[PDB]
Amino acid sequence: RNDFYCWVCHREGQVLCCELCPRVYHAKCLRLTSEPEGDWFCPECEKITVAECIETQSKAMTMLTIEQLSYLLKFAIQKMKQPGTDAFQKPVPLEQHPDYAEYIFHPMDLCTLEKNAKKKMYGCTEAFLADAKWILHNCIIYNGGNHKLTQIAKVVIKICEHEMNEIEVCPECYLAACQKRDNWFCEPCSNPHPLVWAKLKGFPFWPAKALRDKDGQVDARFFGQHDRAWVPINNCYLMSKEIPFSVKKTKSIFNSAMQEMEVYVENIRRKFGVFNYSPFRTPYTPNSQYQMLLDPTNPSAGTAKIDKQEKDM
Ligand SMILES: [Zn+2]
Ligand SMILES: [Zn+2]
Ligand SMILES: [Zn+2]
């Protein structure tokens, strides 16, 4: 049965109906070039469609099976199920809220989410977040937007959003971070992240993994403390023997980070057989291949075809 409350603003009124799911939307809340005809898939269903399409799925998703994703979603639910999320951990009981089903046509809770994930019902992170969002929508409808429960539901979704985003950035990093085995941060990924010197305004030059590029910013994960930041691409250099010098007050901390990095370099060398340090102050460029070149003096020869076409919880 279709919902009566707009998925965007959580209010009733004249609402559009999705063909593919029970969500409904005020035309106005969608900021359209014009209202639809006849075939309309909502923005949630559009997103999920674009994502679960083999040829336009994300690096993360192309890497992942449904089953592998379900294992990762299990970790994400554990993050969502923090202390103080009591109200949303099990289905709302009718004994306490006898009129709940007059307002809420599509109940959801964290336990249901977990069971659904285990049953391999989610084909992508997008589908998981969209389903989790019923918790927040429902809470706002029934309790009110300013109710204290809504604060808690908002945090649950913000946690979900963060976790989904992290899976999408790199599922292998995510799994590593979840299990926290020793030197998890030194374990190379199947498509290894470039090592850079990264300088954030206000901070000393520091070793990091470059996880992605977006609009001239690099998603840098720093050795040592395992902090993170977007770093301007022009402030990122490929890793070199010579260190770009910064005054600092944290000498043992820097040493620890450099130690960690050298383990990582040893691991990359072990797993892929190469690692190329670059000349001092070599700009990092998007999707940099340099560190993996067979012969760094011959970029046209590229990386070594060493894959055997082969394919940890
Ligand atoms: Zn609306
Ligand atoms: Zn839909
Ligand atoms: Zn990774």
Side-chain angles (χ1 to χ4, degrees), residues 1-58 60-304 306 310-311 313:
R1 177 135 163 225
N2 293 328
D3 199 348
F4 288 0
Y5 298 86
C6 178
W7 182 252
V8 175
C9 76
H10 315 293
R11 295 177 179 288
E12 295 182 293
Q14 195 58 55
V15 292
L16 301 183
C17 295
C18 181
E19 280 300 286
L20 295 184
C21 78
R23 288 174 186 92
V24 303
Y25 297 73
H26 299 112
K28 290 178 187 182
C29 284
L30 300 159
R31 308 181 54 88
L32 298 165
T33 325
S34 94
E35 294 201 11
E37 321 196 78
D39 274 19
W40 190 67
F41 306 162
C42 69
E44 295 296 345
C45 286
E46 167 154 35
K47 214 170 43 210
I48 290 164
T49 296
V50 173
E52 290 176 354
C53 164
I54 296 196
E55 64 189 353
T56 166
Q57 72 175 332
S58 64
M61 283 321 304
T62 44
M63 156 66 55
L64 285 177
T65 63
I66 306 309
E67 187 185 322
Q68 279 167 341
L69 174 60
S70 73
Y71 297 154
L72 295 198
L73 294 173
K74 190 164 179 50
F75 282 105
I77 275 154
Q78 186 185 352
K79 299 286 289 279
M80 290 163 71
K81 200 190 320 189
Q82 275 171 49
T85 62
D86 298 72
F88 302 108
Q89 285 169 14
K90 301 229 174 158
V92 170
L94 226 62
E95 294 72 38
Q96 275 86 288
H97 305 283
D99 61 341
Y100 194 74
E102 307 292 353
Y103 300 96
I104 305 307
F105 289 173
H106 296 286
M108 181 59 59
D109 62 274
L110 295 171
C111 183
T112 298
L113 225 48
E114 191 176 338
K115 298 174 197 195
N116 284 0
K118 194 183 181 180
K119 290 177 186 191
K120 297 184 292 294
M121 293 188 202
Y122 305 107
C124 62
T125 52
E126 282 87 353
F128 188 75
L129 178 61
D131 221 22
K133 280 181 178 176
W134 286 106
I135 299 172
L136 174 57
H137 178 68
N138 288 349
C139 180
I140 292 173
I141 290 158
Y142 184 79
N143 297 305
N146 297 320
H147 192 280
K148 188 55 63 188
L149 282 172
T150 295
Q151 165 177 296
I152 296 183
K154 278 182 186 169
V155 170
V156 166
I157 299 303
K158 279 181 185 185
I159 291 173
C160 188
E161 277 167 351
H162 174 77
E163 296 303 304
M164 290 315 102
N165 283 345
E166 281 294 282
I167 289 172
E168 286 294 351
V169 174
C170 179
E172 304 179 58
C173 282
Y174 183 84
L175 180 58
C178 286
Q179 302 182 146
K180 295 292 194 189
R181 285 177 300 90
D182 265 46
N183 286 1
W184 59 275
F185 190 80
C186 305
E187 81 181 39
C189 297
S190 68
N191 183 23
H193 306 305
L195 287 202
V196 301
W197 296 110
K199 174 93 179 74
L200 206 56
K201 193 178 197 302
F203 294 85
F205 269 105
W206 207 268
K209 303 182 196 170
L211 263 57
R212 40 166 181 161
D213 304 273
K214 192 183 172 191
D215 309 323
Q217 308 292 323
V218 171
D219 180 5
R221 306 306 171 85
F222 299 94
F223 286 85
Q225 305 183 340
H226 308 144
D227 290 340
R228 61 189 291 158
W230 289 108
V231 180
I233 198 171
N234 297 334
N235 286 7
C236 292
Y237 300 82
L238 291 181
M239 178 52 53
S240 57
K241 293 304 304 182
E242 188 180 339
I243 306 180
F245 174 76
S246 294
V247 183
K248 57 200 161 301
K249 52 179 155 192
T250 47
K251 203 135 293 161
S252 46
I253 296 170
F254 187 80
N255 288 339
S256 293
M258 294 301 290
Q259 283 195 239
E260 192 173 48
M261 195 197 74
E262 289 166 9
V263 174
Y264 173 87
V265 168
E266 291 163 7
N267 292 350
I268 289 271
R269 267 169 178 154
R270 180 154 43 68
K271 185 186 199 293
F272 299 114
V274 306
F275 179 88
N276 306 311
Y277 283 92
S278 68
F280 185 56
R281 288 193 152 285
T282 300
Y284 166 89
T285 55
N287 201 62
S288 181
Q289 298 292 292
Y290 180 88
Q291 291 172 355
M292 285 291 108
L293 295 174
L294 178 57
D295 181 351
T297 77
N298 188 359
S300 72
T303 190
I306 192 44
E310 197 183 8
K311 65 175 192 168
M313 280 267 290

